[PDB]
Design an enzyme around this catalytic site. Structure first.
Site, PDB file in Angstrom:
ATOM      1  N   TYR A 193      34.900  38.277  29.412  1.00 31.03           N
ATOM      2  CA  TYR A 193      35.033  36.960  29.980  1.00 31.03           C
ATOM      3  C   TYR A 193      34.669  35.964  28.893  1.00 31.03           C
ATOM      4  CZ  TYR A 193      35.025  32.829  32.880  1.00 31.03           C
ATOM      5  OH  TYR A 193      35.261  31.557  33.368  1.00 31.03           O
ATOM      6  N   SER A 217      41.516  34.824  33.004  1.00 35.92           N
ATOM      7  CA  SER A 217      41.116  33.421  32.915  1.00 35.92           C
ATOM      8  C   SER A 217      40.504  33.198  31.535  1.00 35.92           C
ATOM      9  CB  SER A 217      40.124  33.108  34.038  1.00 35.92           C
ATOM     10  OG  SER A 217      39.948  31.723  34.243  1.00 35.92           O
ATOM     11  N   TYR A 218      39.276  32.697  31.446  1.00 39.55           N
ATOM     12  CA  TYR A 218      38.700  32.473  30.117  1.00 39.55           C
ATOM     13  C   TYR A 218      38.739  33.773  29.321  1.00 39.55           C
ATOM     14  CZ  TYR A 218      36.045  30.178  26.402  1.00 39.55           C
ATOM     15  OH  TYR A 218      35.648  29.623  25.210  1.00 39.55           O
ATOM     16  N   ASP A 235      49.737  29.039  40.133  1.00 37.28           N
ATOM     17  CA  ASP A 235      48.409  28.778  39.580  1.00 37.28           C
ATOM     18  C   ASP A 235      48.233  27.276  39.278  1.00 37.28           C
ATOM     19  OD1 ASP A 235      45.961  28.754  38.228  1.00 37.28           O
ATOM     20  OD2 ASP A 235      46.359  30.684  37.203  1.00 37.28           O
ATOM     21  N   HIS A 248      45.415  31.323  40.944  1.00 39.77           N
ATOM     22  CA  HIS A 248      44.595  31.818  39.836  1.00 39.77           C
ATOM     23  C   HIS A 248      43.893  33.151  40.151  1.00 39.77           C
ATOM     24  CE1 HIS A 248      42.840  31.460  35.918  1.00 39.77           C
ATOM     25  NE2 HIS A 248      41.602  31.379  36.369  1.00 39.77           N
TER      26      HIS A 248
END
Ligand SMILES: Cc1cc(N2CCN([C@@H]3CN[C@H](C(=O)N4CCSC4)C3)CC2)n(-c2ccccc2)n1
Ligand SMILES: Cc1cc(N2CCN([C@@H]3CN[C@H](C(=O)N4CCSC4)C3)CC2)n(-c2ccccc2)n1
Ligand SMILES: *[C@@H]1O[C@H](CO)[C@@H](O[C@@H]2O[C@H](CO)[C@@H](O)[C@H](O)[C@H]2NC(C)=O)[C@H](O)[C@H]1NC(C)=O
Ligand SMILES: *[C@@H]1O[C@H](CO)[C@@H](O[C@@H]2O[C@H](CO)[C@@H](O)[C@H](O)[C@H]2NC(C)=O)[C@H](O)[C@H]1NC(C)=O
Ligand SMILES: *[C@@H]1O[C@H](CO)[C@@H](O[C@@H]2O[C@H](CO)[C@@H](O)[C@H](O)[C@H]2NC(C)=O)[C@H](O)[C@H]1NC(C)=O
Ligand SMILES: *[C@@H]1O[C@H](CO)[C@@H](O[C@@H]2O[C@H](CO)[C@@H](O)[C@H](O)[C@H]2NC(C)=O)[C@H](O)[C@H]1NC(C)=O
Ligand SMILES: *[C@@H]1O[C@H](CO)[C@@H](O[C@@H]2O[C@H](CO)[C@@H](O)[C@H](O)[C@H]2NC(C)=O)[C@H](O)[C@H]1NC(C)=O
Ligand SMILES: *[C@@H]1O[C@H](CO)[C@@H](O)[C@H](O)[C@H]1NC(C)=O
Ligand SMILES: *[C@@H]1O[C@H](CO)[C@@H](O)[C@H](O)[C@H]1NC(C)=O
Ligand SMILES: *[C@@H]1O[C@H](CO)[C@@H](O)[C@H](O)[C@H]1NC(C)=O
Ligand SMILES: *[C@@H]1O[C@H](CO)[C@@H](O)[C@H](O)[C@H]1NC(C)=O
Ligand SMILES: *[C@@H]1O[C@H](CO)[C@@H](O)[C@H](O)[C@H]1NC(C)=O
Ligand SMILES: *[C@@H]1O[C@H](CO)[C@@H](O)[C@H](O)[C@H]1NC(C)=O
Ligand SMILES: *[C@@H]1O[C@H](CO)[C@@H](O)[C@H](O)[C@H]1NC(C)=O
EC number: 3.4.14.5
Lengths: 729, 729
Positions: free
Chosen positions: B510, B593-594, B671, B703
Site C-alpha cells: 500500500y 489504489s495508492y 471509479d 473504487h
C-alpha cells in the site's frame, strides 16, 4: 526448407509492401501520378510524361501537405493540410489555392480555417465549401465568397455535409452537395438533428489533459428519433447579379412525407434535370423523383409520370442502399442495377416516363457495378466468369445488340487475375485495370477504341522476387454443399500443407448481410503470418446472409440477424474437421465488428466446436447500434414489429455458455461507431455469471483501432492468445 | 497432513466468519446489541438483558429495513430503507419513525423520500435532516419540520452535507451538521462548488438502457478551483412556524481569508462554547478558534486570545488532518495529539487562553487516539508496548501525576492480544475491549473504577476449533535495518513453512503516507488463500513515509511522492530475495489504489527484482488525483512550487521499463475516486512504447470493485495471473 517464414514483425512493420498504381484522370487523354513526390502528367496513348508539379515547389510552404486536387480546367490546385480525422469519411483541414498560371499562392479571400469540406465544380474552377455547417460558393478562387445558408448550427443543422448516421450508413460519404454537370446549379441536403439523442463517451487525450473530455455526437440507436432532411437547389450563376439567391426546395413525395424517411440518392441527369431517391424508415420502399427546372417560374418540377418505385417482398432494397442510376447523355433513359424475378442483380434499362424496365443482362450471377456508359457501350463488373461469386471481371455490352457481350478482363491472365476493378478516363477512351488476385496485383492501361493492352503500369515483380525466398502460405478457394446449395469458403494454408497431418484451424469471421469473406483477392495480413509461421489454417466462410450470390441467400437473415449467419459458421467448422486435416481439439474463431458479434454468438452457442475466440469491437445488442443499419435488417424494436427478435439476439443472453471457451474481448474506448458500451455490457454479463475471460481496452482508439502503435499492440496481443490457446504440451 | 487448505472459495464465499460484538452505549450503564434481528438492552454490571425491540414488530412494515437508530431518550426509532449508495460514506435512503410509547408508526409529516442525512440530537429526540441540499429540523417526530436553509442546489450549494472532496478527504464522512451537547444549538457547514470543475464518465447501467449516461461530479483535481465553505449556528430552541430561521455565521480568521482554505474540525466544548479548526490550502498552517455564545448579542464571539495556531516545518499538519480536541467538562482546557519536538505524536494539554501546551506523554512511540476523558484519567490508545509500532494497547494516565501511566490491555493476554480498540460508556464507567490480533478476535467488558474484567463477550470459540481442521498459514512480524533505522515487515507464511525450502513471494503494497501494512491484526483475506493453498509467501513492508513511527519517517516523502516509498519496497524485496527461503526468480508485487500506484512505479523502476505484478485502480499521475489529498503531500503543481516533481512522478514516464515484466492492470469504469482515466493513460503509454500487458476493466464498478460478482471475478482473475506467473518449466 530453409527459407524464413512470413512473421508477425513482417506484417506489423510492412517488410513486404504491395506496389500500387493510383492515377487520377484529368481528361480523356491524361492522368496524374505521384512519383518521388513529384506529380507527373501522363499521356495515355504513348505513356510519356512531364512534371506537372515539381517536388521542390512546397518546401518553403511551412506545412506538411496532406493531399491535393486540381480544378477541372487545370488553372488552379487545391492544397489540403492540418488534416485531422473525424469519422470514417469526414475530416477537417486547412486549405490554400495555388494559381497554376501565375505560379503563385492566393493570399486574399482565402478558404477559412476549420473548413469541413470543399469541392471544385465539375467544370471550370468554382468552389463550394462548408464552414460552420453553412455552404459558401466562390466564383473565382481569389474573390469573396457568397454565403448560401444561414442555418448552420453545431451538432444540430448540417447544410451540405452529412450528420454521423448519413455519413456512416446512408451516403458512406461526408459531403451532401452535388454540382450540376456544367456547374450552374448547386444541389444540397440539409440535415436536422434537433431531437436526435446523443452518444456520450470519454476522450482522455494526451496525459497533459487534467480532465477527460466528453465527446457528444447525435447518433440515433435503433427505434430512436432520426434526423430529418430537406433538399435544395440554388442557381450559382445568379449569385453575382443578386443579393441573396433563393434556394429552391424540392419536397419529398407524399408517400414519403407520411412518416420518417431518408434521402438515399442524388444524381444529376442533364444541366436542367436532377433525380432524387427517397427511402421510408422501413427500408423496403423507395421512390425516385425526376425533376426538371421550370425556367419561367424558377422552380423545379417532378412529374408523377417520371417517378419510379422500388420495393421488396423478401428483404430490404439494394445491397446496402437502393442502387444508383446511370443516365444516357440526353437524360431520357437510365440504367440501374436491380434484383430480377429470380432474385439476382442485373442491369435494368428505364425510360424516364415508363415504370417497367427491360433487363439487359441475366443469369445465376450478379452485376457488381456499372462502371461507364458511352453512346455504344455499357461497361460493368460482374462475377459471371466461371460461376465464381468471389471473382470479378469487366464486361462490355453492345447497346444496339444485348447478345453481344465481351469479357474484357477474363482471359488476360486467368491464372493470376480473377478479381478486377477499373478506372475509366473522362469519356471512357481509356481504362486502367486493377487486378487484385489471386496472384500479385497487376495494373494495366487499355485503349477503349480497340480494347488493346497499351502497357503494364505496375506488375509487382520487385515483391515477387522477395516472396520467392519466403515460405508463403497458399490459398484454397472452393465450395461445399448444404441442403443442395453452394456455399463458398477460402483457406489460408501453411506452406508444405499436408492433407495427412492434423492442423489447428482459426475461423476468420465477418458474415454481415451482403458480406463476402471467400474471394480471389491476394492479401498480406495477420492470417498470412498465422498460416506461414504458426502453421494455422485460417478459414472464412460465406453462409446465409452473404452477398453476390442472389436474394435467396442474402435475405435469408432478413429480420433474423444472429441466427443462420451464426449457425452456418458453426456448420462450416464441422465440415472442415470432417475433411480430416483439422485438429478437432484446436478450433478457434475470431472476428472484428460484425465479425466480433458473430464470433461472440458462436462462442456463446454451447456448440462445443471451438476451444477459444477473439471478438474485436463487437456489436452485443442490436438496440445499441445505429438506426439506419440495424432497422434495415431488423425493422423496429417495438412489440408490434420485431422486439422479440432484438431481445433474443444479444450476446449477453449467452453469458453462461462462455464457461466452455477461452474468450478474448477487445474494444477501443473512443469507438464512435460500435460504442464501448456494447463490450462494457458483454463484460458485465460475464462477470455476473462468474465467467473468467480476457479483456483489452484501447484508450482513445476508435472502431478501426488503426493508429500505428495500437495496431501493432492488438495483433501482438491476439497472437500470444492464439498461440497460447493452441500450444501443445 | 490430511486437513484441507484455506482455498480461494473459502475466501470468496466467507466459509470462515469472524464473529463480532458491536454494541452501542446508551447511558453510563447500559448498551444495545443486535441479536437475531432483535434489539437487546444490556446492563454492563451484571450482563443481564431485556428485549428492547422484538424482530417481528415490523414483520408487516412493507420494505426490508436497512438500519435502525433509536432516539437517545429511547422514545422513538428511526427506520432506514430504500438505501442507495452514493460515494464512500454518502447515500440516500427513505425513513419512517416509530413511536415506542404509542407503539405506532408516525404518519403525519414524514421525513421526505431521497433524504440525504438525518441525525437525532444527542439528548432527547429532535431531528435535523438534509433533503435537496437544505437543512430541516423537527422538534417532535410528528410535528411539521422547520426549514433552516433555502440556498441548497444540486452540485452547487451544500448545506449540512459535504461535497465530494470534503466527504472523501476532509471529514471522511457525509454529515456537515453538529448538534450542541444538549441539542439547543445546531451547527452546520455550507459548501459552494460553483467553479469546481466536473469529472465526467460513462455509466452503462442495466442491459436495457439504450444510451449510456454521463455522471458528472464536482471534483477538484490538484491545483484546480476548490469548493468554498461557510459556517453557521442556529438556535433550534427559538424557531417559528411563521418566521424564517436565523443562522448566525462564524467567519474564519483573517489569516485564512487571505486565500484558499479549509474547515477541518468542528467540536462543541460546552452548551455555549464551540471550537473550529481552519486549514490553509497549503496544509502546514491551521488555526483553532474557540467561540462563545453572547446571550446579549445573540452572536458568537471568538476571542483572538483563544486562537490556537498549529504548524509543521517538515510536512503537513496531523496524520491526515489536524487532530481533534478533547475538552474537559467545563470547557476551559483540552487535550490534543500533536507532534512533539522529536516529531513523535503525543498528548498535549491546552488552556483555552494560553499559547503553549504541556505534553503529558513522551517517548519514541506514539499515541493513536484519545478515547475517554474523566476529571481523574485520560484513556488513550498507543503503540508503546514492547516498542512495537504495529501493536495497539489501551492506557490511562493520571491527570494529577503524569508519571502514573497504567496499561489496561497489555498483559490481559499477550500471546493472543497485542492489538486493541476500545469503546467507553457515556461517562467512562465501563469499557469494551476489542482485541483483533495476532490471535482470534476477543471481546471483553470491563469497569473503570478498578479495571476489573467483568466478562467475555465473544471469544470466537466456534471459529477456533473450525480453524484447527484447516492448514492455516502463520504470520511473522519482524524488522530490517536501513541506515540504522528499524523498518517493519510482515510475512504471511504457508503451513509447515520450511526455511530450507525456497518459496515464491508476493509483495503486498500500500505504502501511502501514514500507512501501516505490518501489524498484529488477524486477517482472513486473499493473502490467506495464497499462503495456505498456493504456498506463496505474502510480505508487506512499511518504509519511508509510513506512519506511527514519528515524522522523521512519515515526512520523508514530503513533496516527494513516488520516491522513497517506492525505493523502499524494492530494497525490502531485494533483502527478502537474499534470504534463503525466498525464490529470487519468483517475486511478484501487487497493490490497490495508492498501492496500485506504488506497484506500477516499482514495476517501471527497472530494478529487475520483480517478475510480474498487479495494479488495481492505481493513481498514475498526481495531477489527476483530488486537491485535498494530493496537495497535502505534493503542494501545488505550478513551476513556482512543485510542478517538476508532479511530472517526475508519473507511471507513464516509466513505460519503457515495463518491457521486462508481466503486468496486469485492472480498474472499474465508474471509479469516482481514482478515475478510470488514470489507467487509461497507463494503457495508452504502454501501447505507445510497444509493451505487452494484461488488463481488465469492470463495467460500473467503483473504487472498491466491491459488488459480490465483481469481487469474486477480480480475485479469480488475479489468482489465475499469480499462479501463471509462478509456474515453473
Ligand atoms: C460495397 C459497399 C459496401 C458498403 N457499406 C458501407 C457501409 N457499411 C456499414 C456502415 N456501418 C456498418 C457498421 O460499421 N457495422 C454494422 C454492424 S457491425 C458495425 C457497416 C456496410 C458496407 N456500401 C455502401 C453502403 C451505403 C452507401 C454507399 C455504399 N457499398
Ligand atoms: C486513520 C485515518 C485514516 C484516514 N483516512 C481517510 C481518507 N483517506 C484518503 C481518502 N481518499 C484517499 C484515496 O482514496 N486515495 C489516496 C491515494 S490513492 C486513492 C485516501 C486516507 C485515510 N483518516 C482520516 C482522514 C481525514 C479525516 C478523518 C479521518 N483517519
Ligand atoms: C438569405 O435568405 C434567407 C431566407 O430568406 C435569410 O434567412 C432567414 O432570415 C430570417 C431572419 O433573419 C429568419 O427568421 C429565417 O428563418 C431565415 N431563413 C432561412 C431559410 O435561413 C437570410 O437572412 C438571407 N441572408 C441575407 C444576408 O440577407
Ligand atoms: C429543426 O427541427 C426543429 C423541430 O424538430 C425546429 O424547431 C422548431 O421551430 C419552430 C419555429 O418554426 C418553433 O416554434 C419550435 O418550438 C421548434 N421546435 C423545437 C423542438 O425546437 C427547427 O426550426 C428545425 N430547424 C430548421 C428547419 O432549420
Ligand atoms: C450550363 O447549363 C445551364 C442550364 O441550361 C445553362 O444556362 C442556360 O443558358 C442558356 C443559354 O443558351 C439560357 O437560355 C438559359 O437562360 C440559361 N439558364 C440558366 C438557368 O442559367 C448554361 O449556359 C450552361 N453553362 C455552360 C458554361 O455551358
Ligand atoms: C457561490 O459562489 C459564487 C462565486 O463562486 C457566487 O457567485 C457570485 O455572486 C456574486 C454576488 O451575488 C456576484 O458578484 C458574482 O458575479 C458571482 N460569481 C459567479 C462566478 O457566479 C454565488 O452567489 C455563491 N452562492 C452562495 C449561496 O454563496
Ligand atoms: C441547553 O443549554 C442551553 C445553553 O445554556 C440552555 O439555554 C439557556 O438556559 C438558561 C437556563 O438554564 C436560560 O437562562 C438561557 O436564557 C438559555 N439560553 C439560550 C441561548 O437558549 C438550555 O436550557 C439547555 N437545553 C436543555 C434542553 O436542557
Ligand atoms: C525529387 O525529384 C527527383 C526525381 O527525379 C529526385 O532527385 C528526388 O528523389 C525527388 N524526391 C524528393 C526530393 O523527395
Ligand atoms: C507525349 O508525346 C507527344 C508526341 O508524340 C506530345 O505531343 C505530347 O504532348 C507528350 N505529352 C506529355 C505529357 O509529355
Ligand atoms: C415492408 O415490410 C413490412 C414489415 O416487414 C410489411 O408489413 C410490408 O408490407 C412490406 N412491404 C412490402 C412491399 O412487402
Ligand atoms: C438487570 O438486573 C437488575 C436487577 O439486579 C434490574 O434492575 C435491571 O433492570 C436488569 N437490566 C436489564 C437491562 O434487563
Ligand atoms: C415516497 O414514495 C412513495 C411511493 O411512491 C409514497 O407512497 C410515499 O408517500 C413517499 N414518502 C414520503 C415521505 O413522501
Ligand atoms: C424565507 O426566505 C426565502 C428565501 O430568502 C423565501 O423564498 C421565502 O419566501 C421566505 N419565507 C418567509 C415566510 O419569509
Ligand atoms: C508551507 O510549505 C511551503 C512550501 O514548501 C513553505 O515555503 C512554508 O515554509 C510552509 N509554511 C509554513 C507556515 O511553515
Amino acid at each position: 526448407d530453409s527459407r524464413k517464414t512470413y512473421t508477425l514483425t513482417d506484417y506489423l512493420k510492412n517488410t513486404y509492401r504491395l506496389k500500387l498504381y493510383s492515377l487520377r484522370w484529368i481528361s480523356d487523354h491524361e492522368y496524374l501520378y505521384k512519383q518521388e513526390n513529384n506529380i507527373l502528367v501522363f499521356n495515355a496513348e504513348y505513356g510519356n510524361s512531364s512534371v506537372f508539379l515539381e517536388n521542390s515547389t512546397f518546401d518553403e510552404f511551412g506545412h506538411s501537405i496532406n493531399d491535393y486536387s486540381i480544378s477541372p480546367d487545370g488553372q488552379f490546385i487545391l492544397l489540403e493540410y492540418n488534416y485531422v480525422k473525424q469519422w470514417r469519411h469526414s475530416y477537417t483541414a486547412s486549405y490554400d489555392i495555388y494559381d497554376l498560371n501565375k505560379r503563385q499562392l492566393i493570399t486574399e479571400e482565402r478558404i477559412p480555417n476549420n473548413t469541413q469540406w470543399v469541392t471544385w465544380s465539375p467544370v471550370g474552377h468554382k468552389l463550394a465549401y462548408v464552414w460552420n455547417n453553412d455552404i459558401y460558393v466562390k466564383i473565382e478562387p481569389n474573390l469573396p465568397s457568397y454565403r448560401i445558408t444561414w442555418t448552420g448550427k453545431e451538432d444540430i443543422i448540417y447544410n451540405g455535409i452529412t450528420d454521423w448516421v448519413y455519413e456512416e450508413e446512408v451516403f458512406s460519404a461526408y459531403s451532401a452537395l452535388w454540382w450540376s454537370p456544367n456547374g450552374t446549379f448547386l444541389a444540397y441536403a440539409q440535415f436536422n438533428d434537433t431531437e436526435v439523442p446523443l452518444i456520450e463517451y470519454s476522450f482522455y487525450s494526451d496525459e497533459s489533459l487534467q480532465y477527460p473530455k466528453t465527446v457528444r455526437v447525435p447518433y440515433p440507436k435503433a427505434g430512436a428519433v432520426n434526423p430529418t432532411v430537406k433538399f435544395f437547389v440554388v442557381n450559382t450563376d445568379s449569385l453575382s447579379s443578386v443579393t441573396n439567391a433563393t434556394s429552391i426546395q424540392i419536397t419529398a413525395p407524399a408517400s414519403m412525407l407520411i412518416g420518417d424517411h431518408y434521402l438515399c440518392d442524388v444524381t444529376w441527369a442533364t444541366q436542367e434535370r436532377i433525380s432524387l431517391q427517397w427511402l421510408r424508415r422501413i427500408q423496403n420502399y423507395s421512390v425516385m423523383d425526376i425533376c426538371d427546372y421550370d425556367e419561367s417560374s424558377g422552380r423545379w418540377n417532378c412529374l408523377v409520370a417520371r417517378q419510379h418505385i422500388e420495393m421488396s417482398t423478401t428483404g430490404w432494397v439494394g445491397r446496402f442502399r437502393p442502387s444508383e442510376p446511370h443516365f444516357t447523355l440526353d437524360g431520357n433513359s437510365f440504367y440501374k442495377i436491380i434484383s430480377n424475378e429470380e432474385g439476382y442483380r442485373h442491369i435494368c434499362y428505364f425510360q424516364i416516363d415508363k415504370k417497367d424496365c427491360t433487363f439487359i443482362t441475366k443469369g445465376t450471377w450478379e452485376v457488381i457495378g456499372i462502371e461507364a456508359l458511352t453512346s455504344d457501350y455499357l461497361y460493368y463488373i460482374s462475377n459471371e466468369y466461371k460461376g465464381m461469386p468471389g471473382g470479378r471481371n469487366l464486361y462490355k455490352i453492345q447497346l444496339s445488340d444485348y447478345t453481344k457481350v465481351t469479357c474484357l478482363s477474363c482471359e488476360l491472365n486467368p491464372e493470376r487475375c480473377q478479381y478486377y476493378s477499373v478506372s475509366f478516363s473522362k469519356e471512357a477512351k481509356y481504362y486502367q485495370l486493377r487486378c487484385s488476385g489471386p496472384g500479385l496485383p497487376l495494373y494495366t492501361l487499355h485503349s477503349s477504341v480497340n480494347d488493346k493492352g497499351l502497357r503494364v503500369l505496375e506488375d509487382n515483380s520487385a515483391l515477387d522476387k522477395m516472396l520467392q525466398n519466403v515460405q508463403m502460405p497458399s490459398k484454397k478457394l472452393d465450395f461445399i454443399i448444404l441442403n443442395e446449395t453452394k456455399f463458398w469458403y477460402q483457406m489460408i494454408l501453411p506452406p508444405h500443407f499436408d492433407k495427412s497431418k492434423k492442423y489447428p484451424l482459426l475461423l476468420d469471421v465477418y458474415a454481415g448481410p451482403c458480406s463476402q469473406k471467400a474471394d480471389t483477392v491476394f492479401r498480406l495480413n495477420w492470417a498470412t503470418y498465422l498460416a506461414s509461421t504458426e502453421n494455422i489454417i485460417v478459414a472464412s466462410f460465406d453462409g446465409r446472409g452473404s452477398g453476390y450470390q442472389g436474394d435467396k441467400i442474402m435475405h435469408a437473415i432478413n429480420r433474423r440477424l444472429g441466427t443462420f449467419e451464426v449457425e452456418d459458421q458453426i456448420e462450416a467448422a464441422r465440415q472442415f474437421s470432417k475433411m480430416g486435416f483439422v485438429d478437432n481439439k484446436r478450433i478457434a474463431i475470431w472476428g472484428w465488428s460484425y465479425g466480433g458479434y458473430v464470433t461472440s454468438m458462436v462462442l456463446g452457442s454451447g456448440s462445443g466446436v471451438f476451444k477459444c475466440g477473439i471478438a474485436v469491437a463487437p456489436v452485443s445488442r442490436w438496440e445499441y447500434y445505429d438506426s439506419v443499419y440495424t432497422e434495415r435488417y431488423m425493422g423496429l424494436p417495438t412489440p408490434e414489429d420485431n422486439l422479440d427478435h432484438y431481445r433474443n439476439s444479444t450476446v449477453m443472453s449467452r453469458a453462461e455458455n462462455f464457461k466452455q471457451v477461452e474468450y478474448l474481448l477487445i474494444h477501443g474506448t473512443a469507438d464512435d461507431n460500435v460504442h464501448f458500451q456494447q463490450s462494457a455490457q458483454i463484460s458485465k454479463a460475464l462477470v455476473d455469471v462468474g465467467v473468467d475471460f480476457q479483456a483489452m481496452w484501447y484508450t482513445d482508439e476508435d472502431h478501426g483501432i488503426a493508429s500505428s502503435t495500437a495496431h501493432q499492440h492488438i495483433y501482438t496481443h491476439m497472437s500470444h492468445f492464439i498461440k497460447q490457446c493452441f500450444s501443445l504440451p
